[PDB]
Amino acid sequence: ATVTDMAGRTVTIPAKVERILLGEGRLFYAVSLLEGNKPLDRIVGWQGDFRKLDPQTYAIYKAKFPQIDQIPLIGNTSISPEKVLTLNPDIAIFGLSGSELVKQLEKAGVPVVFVDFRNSPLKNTLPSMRLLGKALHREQQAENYINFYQDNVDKVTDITNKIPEDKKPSVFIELRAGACCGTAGKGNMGDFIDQAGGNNIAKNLLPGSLGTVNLEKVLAAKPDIYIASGGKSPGSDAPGVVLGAQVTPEQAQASLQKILGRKGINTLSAVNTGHSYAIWHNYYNSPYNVLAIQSFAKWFYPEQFADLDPKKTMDSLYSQFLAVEPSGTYWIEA
Ligand SMILES: [Cl-]
Ligand code: NA
């Protein structure tokens, strides 16, 4: 009847939950692990980020669940309402930031539950999933995913927790690489570099999980490994790495060569020797991020993780927890 969410708030959990509001649409990723073969049946409204900013994954779901388009889009605009109480929701899910709708929902006695996959994903990913298991009456499903997640993160931290600091390769990840050089320090994808045995150039070169750092000159740190994140669609014309549910290995590869073609970056040692990589950006706010930890690791220590196939982890994730087929490309090499 009560949970403590990742904001420390105490929240009563109604006995019946069938109408879920998503205050950030891409919280569908977390919900989708709990919902089995009926991923949309309980979403009565979401903020539009998932439909508009991950159109590739959305389209995969549309092809199988056409009713996805009628799920109302919460916003002020394109958006379909912004007075959610008329959806009579049982519960609402938000991510921690790093607001007004939340206070209004409290007044009406709607339980608002805060999760977090973005600020401190190492600390918060599994507590957020167990929290959602409790608040949405999917405890066994949450625990199932937690064991799958823990077992697949163990496959990595079993090896990289015993690696000396001098052997750790230096790593710079460029977030949203196309706008230079925004990154993550103590947190967000920094956690994934930490878990995967790497040394993040910006690990304390900024006091926070997300931020932007000085341009590519500070990449005279000669990182052993280069990593760019993006989730643009093919033919987008808008600059950025091209990854997602509808991207081919070749289409991903052509976008990475071009991002590695920019000035300065094409002088880095990791670029001209084949140590450059691209990762799906939505791993930065999603409990699927285990796939990015495993991808980082296999890149950082190839010989030591040569038995570890992240595509096989992903196939097993979809097989066990999701209603759609794995498609597209979410990481790529150079
Ligand atoms: Cl974003
Ligand atoms: Na999905």
Residue numbers in the entry: 1 to 77, 81 to 101, 108 to 188, 192 to 346
Question: Could you share sentences copied from the article?
Answer:
Yersinia iron-uptake (Yiu) locus encodes an ABC transporter that is Fur-regulated and has been shown to restore the growth of an enterobactin-deficient mutant strain of Escherichia coli under iron-chelated conditions in vitro. In this report, we document the atomic three-dimensional apo structure of the Yiu SBP YiuA. Structural alignment analysis reveals that YiuA has the greatest degree of structural similarity to cluster A-2 SBPs, which bind chelated metal.
